[PDB]
Amino acid sequence: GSSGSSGMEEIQGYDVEFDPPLESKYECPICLMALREAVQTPCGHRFCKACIIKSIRDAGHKCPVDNEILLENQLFPDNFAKREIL
């Protein structure tokens, strides 16, 4: 009379650690990553020339942070030149 045999096993591994990258540069509150073009806004914020363009066509003329009536044409403040039907 052996009566077979039984047992039990449990393996676990917890660990809560992380190293935050150097955040010493205005980041994009839209995509949450390094600015693509690094374009500024007239309202008073900084976003990716691409992100800002998507936010407008996506939702509409509004800031992704303050939702303030903002237009595209009113962008590209970094450019020290305004070539208009020159």
Q: Which is nearer to Zn ion, 45 or 75 (CB)?
A: 45
CA atoms within 13 A on the CB side of 53: 10
CA angle 47, 51, 56 (to 5 degrees): 105
Residues in 12-31 that interact with Zn ion by CB under 5 A: 28, 30-31
- Looking at the DSSP bridge assignments, the partners of residue 46 are 40
Which of 45, 46, 55, 75 binds Zn ion (CB under 5 A)? It is 45
Residue 16 C-beta: closest distance to Zn ion, Å: 29
Q: Which residues bind Zn ion (CB under 5 A)?
A: 28, 30-31, 43, 45, 48, 51, 63, 65-66
